[PDB]
Amino acid sequence: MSRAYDLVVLGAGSGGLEAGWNAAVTHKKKVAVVDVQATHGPPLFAALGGTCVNVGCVPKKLMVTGAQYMDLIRESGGFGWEMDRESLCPNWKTLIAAKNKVVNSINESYKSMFADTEGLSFHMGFGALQDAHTVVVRKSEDPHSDVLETLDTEYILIATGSWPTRLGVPGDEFCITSNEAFYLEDAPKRMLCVGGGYIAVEFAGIFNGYKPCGGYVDLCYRGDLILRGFDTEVRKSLTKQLGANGIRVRTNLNPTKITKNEDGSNHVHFNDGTEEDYDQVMLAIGRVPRSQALQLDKAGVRTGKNGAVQVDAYSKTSVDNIYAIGDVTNRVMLTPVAINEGAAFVETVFGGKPRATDHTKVACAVFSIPPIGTCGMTEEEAAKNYETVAVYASSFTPLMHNISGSKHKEFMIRIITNESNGEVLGVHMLGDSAPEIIQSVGICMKMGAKISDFHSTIGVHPTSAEELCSMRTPAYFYESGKRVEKLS
Amino acid sequence: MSRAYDLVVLGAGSGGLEAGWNAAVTHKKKVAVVDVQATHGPPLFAALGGTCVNVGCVPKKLMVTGAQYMDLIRESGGFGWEMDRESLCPNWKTLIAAKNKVVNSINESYKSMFADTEGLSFHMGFGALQDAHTVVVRKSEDPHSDVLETLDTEYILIATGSWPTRLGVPGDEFCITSNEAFYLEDAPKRMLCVGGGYIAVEFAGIFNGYKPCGGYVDLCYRGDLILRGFDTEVRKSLTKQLGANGIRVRTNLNPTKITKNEDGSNHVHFNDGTEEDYDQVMLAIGRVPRSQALQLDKAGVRTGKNGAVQVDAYSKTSVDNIYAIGDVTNRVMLTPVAINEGAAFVETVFGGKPRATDHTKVACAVFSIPPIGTCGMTEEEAAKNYETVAVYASSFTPLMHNISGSKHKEFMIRIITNESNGEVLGVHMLGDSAPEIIQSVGICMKMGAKISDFHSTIGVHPTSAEELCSMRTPAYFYESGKRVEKLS
Numbered sequence: 001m002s003r004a005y006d007l008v009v010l011g012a013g014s015g016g017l018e019a020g021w022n023a024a025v026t027h028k029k030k031v032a033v034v035d036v037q038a039t040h041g042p043p044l045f046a047a048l049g050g051t052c053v054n055v056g057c058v059p060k061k062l063m064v065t066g067a068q069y070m071d072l073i074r075e076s077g078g079f080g081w082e083m084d085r086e087s088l089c090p091n092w093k094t095l096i097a098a099k100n101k102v103v104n105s106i107n108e109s110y111k112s113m114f115a116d117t118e119g120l121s122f123h124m125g126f127g128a129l130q131d132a133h134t135v136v137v138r139k140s141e142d143p144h145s146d147v148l149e150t151l152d153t154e155y156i157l158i159a160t161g162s163w164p165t166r167l168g169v170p171g172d173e174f175c176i177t178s179n180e181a182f183y184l185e186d187a188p189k190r191m192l193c194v195g196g197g198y199i200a201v202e203f204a205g206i207f208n209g210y211k212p213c214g215g216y217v218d219l220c221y222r223g224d225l226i227l228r229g230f231d232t233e234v235r236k237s238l239t240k241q242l243g244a245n246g247i248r249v250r251t252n253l254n255p256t257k258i259t260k261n262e263d264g265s266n267h268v269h270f271n272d273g274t275e276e277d278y279d280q281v282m283l284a285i286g287r288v289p290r291s292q293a294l295q296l297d298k299a300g301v302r303t304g305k306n307g308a309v310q311v312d313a314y315s316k317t318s319v320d321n322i323y324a325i326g327d328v329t330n331r332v333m334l335t336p337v338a339i340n341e342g343a344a345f346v347e348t349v350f351g352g353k354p355r356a357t358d359h360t361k362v363a364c365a366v367f368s369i370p371p372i373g374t375c376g377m378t379e380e381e382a383a384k385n386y387e388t389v390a391v392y393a394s395s396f397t398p399l400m401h402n403i404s405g406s407k408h409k410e411f412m413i414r415i416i417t418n419e420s421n422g423e424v425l426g427v428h429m430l431g432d433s434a435p436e437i438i439q440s441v442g443i444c445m446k447m448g449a450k451i452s453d454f455h456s457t458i459g460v461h462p463t464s465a466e467e468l469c470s471m472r473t474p475a476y477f478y479e480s481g482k483r484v485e486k487l488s
Numbered sequence: 489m490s491r492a493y494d495l496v497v498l499g500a501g502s503g504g505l506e507a508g509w510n511a512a513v514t515h516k517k518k519v520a521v522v523d524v525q526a527t528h529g530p531p532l533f534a535a536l537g538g539t540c541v542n543v544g545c546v547p548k549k550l551m552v553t554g555a556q557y558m559d560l561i562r563e564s565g566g567f568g569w570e571m572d573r574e575s576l577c578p579n580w581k582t583l584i585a586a587k588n589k590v591v592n593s594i595n596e597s598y599k600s601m602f603a604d605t606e607g608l609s610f611h612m613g614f615g616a617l618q619d620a621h622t623v624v625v626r627k628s629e630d631p632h633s634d635v636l637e638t639l640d641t642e643y644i645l646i647a648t649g650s651w652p653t654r655l656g657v658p659g660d661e662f663c664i665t666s667n668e669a670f671y672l673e674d675a676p677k678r679m680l681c682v683g684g685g686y687i688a689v690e691f692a693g694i695f696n697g698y699k700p701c702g703g704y705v706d707l708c709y710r711g712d713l714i715l716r717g718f719d720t721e722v723r724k725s726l727t728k729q730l731g732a733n734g735i736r737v738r739t740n741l742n743p744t745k746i747t748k749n750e751d752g753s754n755h756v757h758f759n760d761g762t763e764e765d766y767d768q769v770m771l772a773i774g775r776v777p778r779s780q781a782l783q784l785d786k787a788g789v790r791t792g793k794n795g796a797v798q799v800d801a802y803s804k805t806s807v808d809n810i811y812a813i814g815d816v817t818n819r820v821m822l823t824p825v826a827i828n829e830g831a832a833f834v835e836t837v838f839g840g841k842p843r844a845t846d847h848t849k850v851a852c853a854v855f856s857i858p859p860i861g862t863c864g865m866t867e868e869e870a871a872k873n874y875e876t877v878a879v880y881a882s883s884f885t886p887l888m889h890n891i892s893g894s895k896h897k898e899f900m901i902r903i904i905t906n907e908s909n910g911e912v913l914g915v916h917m918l919g920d921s922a923p924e925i926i927q928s929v930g931i932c933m934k935m936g937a938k939i940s941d942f943h944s945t946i947g948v949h950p951t952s953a954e955e956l957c958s959m960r961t962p963a964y965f966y967e968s969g970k971r972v973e974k975l976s
C-alpha cells in the first residue's frame with residue numbers, strides 16, 4: 001500500500017530524532033516527527049531535542065560544571081591564587097541565563113535541520129494514536145481539544161520518553177521537580193532534595209554550589225544507603241564526601257505532609273515527626289514512562305507496569321508496524337541507549353539488516369561532586385550469578401589534594417571479576433575524571449576484557465586512571481554467594 | 489659463591505626502587521640501593537625516589553595543576569562567579585613551598601621504607617663500577633674523592649637514568665634547565681623556553697600561568713612544527729591553543745649567543761639575528777643517559793651512542809650479571825616503563841620466570857594546557873609500513889566552553905587503523921581529561937582493538953570520551969604510502 005509518510009515519530013527526543021534523521025537521510029524515507037513545542041520552556045518543559053537537550057543531560061551538566069567551580073576556586077588558594085574569599089557566593093541568575101542561551105541555541109539548530117533535510121518534517125502538537133497507521137496531532141494533551149493534523153503512515157515509532165513521579169502526600173503540588181528546578185528565579189537558601197537517586201544526588205550538588213550566603217542543602221532518602229544498585233563502597237564514600245562538601249545527607253527519612261506558608265517558604269513534616277522550613281523542595285522519586293495519553297489501547301499496543309511499552313529485542317510492539325524506544329519502554333533509561341535503540345530500529349525496518357541493542361555491560365555515570373563512573377555488575381549481584389568472584393579494591397587521595405586542602409577527595413576504583421575466568425564483570429569508580437575514564441573501560445568490557453589485560457598494560461603517569469593497571473591482588477572473595485577472606 | 493649482597497642498585501629511581509623493593513620483599517634478597525642524596529635539593533637535584541619524585545613527574549604535575557587555575561578562574565566568571573579579576577596574578581613562592589612539602593614527605597616516606605624493610609638498605613653517595621661483582625660508593629662524582637663504601641654483589645643493576653643536554657653556544661652556563669626551574673625563588677616576567685619537546689611545552693604552560701603582571705612566555709623551536717613524532721593535526725591545534733592562551737610560539741628559531749647583563753637579566757641573540765632580553769632562559773634540548781661517571785669500561789659493559797647502556801630484551805648488558813633499566817637504556821623514557829622494566833628484571837633473575845617489557849603500544853601523555861593523550865602509531869608512520877590505512881577524525885568545542893568563554897579549547901580525537909582488518913594502530917587526543925581517557929584506551933589496544941569495537945560501544949553522555957565511540961566513517965585514506973581521498 002501507499003501512504004503520506006513512511007514514519008511518524010512521536011517525540012523529538014534522543015532516540016526519536018536519531019530514528020527520524022537516519023530514515024530520512026540514509027534511506028530517503030518520508031519522516032514526520034511530532035513534539036509538544038519548538039524551544040525549551042516552563043509551561044511544558046520538554047521540547048525539540050527531547051529531555052536530553054532541554055531539561056536533562058545538557059543543562060544539568062552545565063550546571064554541575066558551574067557548581068564545580070566553588071571547589072576549584074577554594075582549591076586554587078593552596079597553589080597561590082589569592083582573591084576575595086569573604087562570603088564568595090555565585091550568581092544563579094546569570095547561570096540560568098547562560099544555560100538558556102545554549103539550550104535555545106541547540107533548539108535552533110534542530111529547527112534548521114528540518115528545513116535542510118528533505119523528507120524530514122516537524123509537526124508541533126500532541127501526538128496520539130488513532131489506529132495502526134494513523135497518528136492524530138492535537139492542540140493540547142486533552143483528547144477533546146482541536147485536531148491539528150492527521151498523519152497517515154506505514155510505521156509508527158513511540159519515543160515520548162518519561163515524566164517525573166510524585167508522592168501521594170498532602171501538599172505535593174507545592175513541590176518542584178527537575179523540570180521546575182531549571183527555571184527557578186533564585187537559588188534557594190534552604191533546600192530539600194527528596195530521594196536518593198541520580199537526579200537527587202546530582203541536583204543536591206548543583207544547589208550546594210549555588211546556595212547564597214549561609215544557605216544549606218538537605219538530601220533526604222527513605223532508605224539506609226543512597227543510590228541503591230551501585231557499588232556499596234562507592235555509595236558509602238560518596239555519602240561521606242557529599243557530607244564533607246556541605247550537603248547534609250539524611251537517611252531513613254521521608255516527608256509526609258507539606259504546607260504553604262505566607263512568606264513563601266514551605267513547611268515540611270518528616271518521618272521522625274520533625275518540622276522544618278525549606279525555600280524549595282525538589283522531588284527525585286524516579287521517572288514513569290510517558291504514555292498515559294497516547295491511547296495505545298485504540299491500536300492494540302500492550303501497556304505494562306507504570307505504562308511501559310511491551311517490546312521484544314528489536315523494539316517491536318504487539319502490533320507489527322508500531323515500535324517504541326528510549327524511556328517509554330523502561331529498559332535502560334539513558335540518552336546513548338535511546339540513540340542506539342533508534343539507530344537499530346532504522347537498521348531493522350528500513351535498513352534490511354536487523355539489530356538489537358546490547359543492554360548489557362553499558363557504561364553509565366552519576367554527575368555528582370565528585371562523580372561516579374560505573375560499568376557492569378555490583379559485587380552483590382555477581383556473587384549471586386557466579387561460582388567464585390574476586391573483588392579488587394583501591395582507594396587514594398591524589399597528590400594535588402595535599403596542596404589544595406580537599407583531603408576528603410578520595411579516588412576509588414573497585415573491580416569485580418569472575419575468578420574461574422579472570423573476566424572483568426564490573427568496574428566502579430568515584431572521583432574526578434571517572435565518567436571520562438569509564439567510557440574506554442566499557443570498550444574493554446563488551447570486548448570481554450580480563451583482569452590480566454588490565455595490570456599488564458603500562459600505566460600513564462601521573463593520572464588517576466593509571467591505578468586500573470596496578471590492581472593484581474584481590475582484597476577478598478565471594479564463594480557461592482558467601483564472603484570469604486581467602487580461597488579454600 | 490656467597491657475597492655481601494645479591495643486588496646492588498645504582499640509582500634509587502622509578503625503576504631502581506621497583507627492583508630494589510621487589511627483590512627484597514617477595515624474594516627476600518639482600519638489596520643495596522645507591523643514590524646521590526636523601527631528599528630533593530639544588531646542589532644535585534635528583535634524590536631518593538629518582539627524577540619522577542624529586543624533579544619530574546610529580547612536582548611537574550602539581551605545578552601544571554596550579555597553572556591550570558588561571559584558566560578555571562577566568563572560566564568561572566561566565567558561570568556566575570564574581571571576584572576581583574583586576575590584575576589577578578598568582579603567588580609563585582607559596583606554590584614552590586607547597587610543592588617542596590609534598591616532595592619532601594615522599595622523600596621521608598621512602599626513608600622509612602628502608603628502615604621497615606629487611607635486606608633493603610640505602611647507601612648515600614656516588615656509585616661507580618669496579619668489576620663485575622663490586623660497586624664502589626664515592627664521596628663525590630670526582631673518581632678520586634674518598635671511597636665511602638665497597639659493596640660486594642652477585643648482580644648489578646644500573647638505573648641512574650638521564651640528565652639534561654646543553655647546546656654548545658657561548659653563554660650556555662647562564663641558562664637554566666628543568667632542574668633549576670623547580671627552585672627559582674621568583675617567577676620570571678620575561679620567559680624564554682628553548683625547544684619543542686615535552687618539557688618545553690609543559691613548562692611554557694607552567695610559567696604562563698605563574699607569570700607576574702605584564703609578563704610573557706616565548707617558546708622557541710628549531711624546526712617547523714613543535715613536538716615531532718606526534719600526530720601532526722594535534723600538534724597544529726596545540727600550537728594554535730598555546731597561542732590563544734598567551735604563549736608566543738616561535739618556530740624555525742634558535743639561540744646562538746647569550747650574555748649576562750648587569751641588572752641580572754639575560755641578553756639573547758637569535759637565529760634571525762635579533763636581540764631580546766629574558767629574565768630566565770630554560771633549555772629543553774632533551775635528555776642524555778647518565779653513564780659518563782659510572783666507568784662501564786672497567787666492567788666490560790657496552791656504551792652505545794649518547795652513553796646509553798646496550799641491553800637485550802631482558803635488560804641484560806654485555807656481562808651476564810649486570811643489568812640496566814629506565815632512561816639509562818634510552819628505549820622509552822617514561823616512569824611506568826622503567827617500573828615495568830624493573831619488575832620484569834626481578835621476575836627474571838630472582839623469580840625464575842623471565843619476561844620482557846612490551847615497549848610497543850604504550851600509552852603516554854603530554855601535560856600541556858590543554859593536554860595530549862596518545863597511544864600507538866601516527867598516520868605518517870602507519871602509512872610507511874602498512875598496505876592501506878584509514879584516518880578517522882573528530883574535532884569539537886565542548887558545550888561548557890560556550891558559557892565559559894574559552895571557545896578556543898577544541899577537543900580533538902584522531903584514530904589510525906589498518907584498513908585491511910580494522911585494527912586500531914593509533915589513538916591521538918588533545919584536550920582536558922585526555923591523559924585520563926588514553927589509559928583505558930591503551931588497555932583496548934594491548935588487547936588488539938578493532939575500530940568496530942569502538943563505535944559499537946554505547947557512549948557515556950555527556951563526556952568528551954563518548955566521541956571515541958561515534959567515529960565510523962574515515963575522513964581520508966593512505967594507500968601504499970600515498971594520501972588518497974577514497975579507495976579505488
Ligand SMILES: Cc1cc2nc3c(=O)[nH]c(=O)nc-3n(C[C@H](O)[C@H](O)[C@H](O)COP(=O)(O)OP(=O)(O)OC[C@H]3O[C@@H](n4cnc5c(N)ncnc54)[C@H](O)[C@@H]3O)c2cc1C
Binds near residue numbers: 034035199333336367
Ligand atoms: C534531569 C535529568 C538529567 C539526565 N541526565 C542524563 C545524563 O547525564 N546522561 C544520560 O545518559 N541520561 C541522562 N538523563 C536521561 C535521559 O535524558 C533520557 O534517558 C533520554 O532523554 C531518553 O530519550 P527519549 O527519546 O526516550 O526521551 P526524550 O529525549 O525525553 O524524548 C521525549 C520527547 O517526546 C515528547 N512528547 C511527549 N509526549 C508527546 C506526545 N503526546 N506527542 C508527541 N510528542 C510527545 C516530549 O516533548 C519529549 O521531548 C537525564 C534525565 C533527566 C530527567
Ligand SMILES: Cc1cc2nc3c(=O)[nH]c(=O)nc-3n(C[C@H](O)[C@H](O)[C@H](O)COP(=O)(O)OP(=O)(O)OC[C@H]3O[C@@H](n4cnc5c(N)ncnc54)[C@H](O)[C@@H]3O)c2cc1C
Binds near residue numbers: 460539647649
Ligand atoms: C621535568 C620532567 C618531567 C617528567 N614528567 C614525566 C611524566 O609526567 N610522566 C612520565 O611518565 N615520565 C616523566 N618524566 C620522565 C621520567 O621521570 C623518567 O623517565 C624516569 O624517572 C626514569 O626512571 P629511572 O629510574 O631510569 O631514572 P630516575 O628515576 O631519574 O633515577 C635516577 C636516579 O639515579 C641516581 N644516580 C645518578 N647517578 C648516580 C650514581 N653515580 N650513583 C648512584 N646513583 C646515581 C640519581 O640521583 C637519580 O635519582 C619526566 C622527566 C622530567 C625531566
Ligand SMILES: NC(=O)C1=CN([C@@H]2O[C@H](COP(=O)(O)OP(=O)(O)OC[C@H]3O[C@@H](n4cnc5c(N)ncnc54)[C@H](OP(=O)(O)O)[C@@H]3O)[C@@H](O)[C@H]2O)C=CC1
Binds near residue numbers: 195197283
Ligand atoms: N546517567 C545520568 O547521569 C542520569 C541518568 N538518569 C536516568 O533517569 C532516571 C531518573 O530517576 P531519578 O529521579 O534519580 O530517580 P531514579 O529511580 O534513579 O531514583 C529514584 C530514587 O528515589 C527514591 N524513591 C522512590 N520512590 C520514593 C518514594 N515514594 N519516596 C521517597 N523516595 C522514593 C528511590 O529510593 P529506593 O532506591 O528505595 O527505590 C531512589 O533512590 C534514572 O533511573 C536514570 O536511569 C537521571 C539523571 C542523571
Ligand SMILES: NC(=O)C1=CN([C@@H]2O[C@H](COP(=O)(O)OP(=O)(O)OC[C@H]3O[C@@H](n4cnc5c(N)ncnc54)[C@H](OP(=O)(O)O)[C@@H]3O)[C@@H](O)[C@H]2O)C=CC1
Binds near residue numbers: 688852854855
Ligand atoms: N611523559 C611525560 O609527560 C614526559 C616525558 N619526558 C621524557 O623525557 C625526555 C626529555 O626531553 P624533553 O625536553 O621532551 O625533550 P625531548 O628531546 O623529546 O625533546 C627535545 C626537543 O628539543 C629540540 N632540540 C633538540 N636538540 C636541540 C638543539 N640542539 N637546539 C635546539 N633544539 C633542540 C628537539 O627538536 P627536534 O624535534 O628538531 O629534534 C625537541 O623538540 C623526553 O624525550 C621524554 O621521553 C619528559 C617530560 C615529560
Ligand SMILES: CCc1ccc(-n2c(-c3ccc(SC)cc3)cc(CN3CCSCC3)c2C)cc1
Binds near residue numbers: 013014018882
Ligand atoms: C548535518 C549532518 C550532521 C551530523 C551530525 C551532527 N551532530 C550531532 C548530532 C546530534 C543529534 C543527532 S540525532 C539524535 C545526530 C547528530 C551532534 C553533534 C555534536 N558533535 C559535533 C562535533 S563531531 C561530534 C558531535 C553534531 C556535529 C550535526 C550535523
Ligand SMILES: CCc1ccc(-n2c(-c3ccc(SC)cc3)cc(CN3CCSCC3)c2C)cc1
Binds near residue numbers: 397506507601
Ligand atoms: C609500604 C607499602 C606501600 C608500597 C607502595 C606504595 N605506593 C607506591 C609505590 C610506587 C612505586 C614503588 S617502586 C618505584 C614503591 C611504592 C606508589 C603509590 C602511589 N599510589 C598508588 C596506590 S593508590 C595512591 C597512589 C603507593 C601508595 C604504598 C605503600
Ligand SMILES: CCc1ccc(-n2c(-c3ccc(SC)cc3)cc(CN3CCSCC3)c2C)cc1
Binds near residue numbers: 537541594601
Ligand atoms: C615507599 C612506600 C610508599 C610509597 C607511596 C606512598 N604513598 C603515596 C605515594 C603516591 C605517589 C607516589 S609517586 C612519587 C609515591 C607515593 C601516596 C600516599 C597517600 N597517603 C596516604 C597516607 S596519609 C597521606 C596520603 C602514600 C601512602 C606511601 C608509601
Ligand SMILES: CCc1ccc(-n2c(-c3ccc(SC)cc3)cc(CN3CCSCC3)c2C)cc1
Binds near residue numbers: 052053109884887
Ligand atoms: C542534526 C542537527 C544538529 C547537528 C549538530 C548540532 N550541534 C550540536 C549538538 C550538541 C548536542 C546535541 S544533543 C546530544 C545535539 C547537537 C553541537 C554543535 C556544535 N558543537 C559541536 C561540538 S560539541 C558542542 C557543540 C552542533 C552543530 C545540533 C543539531
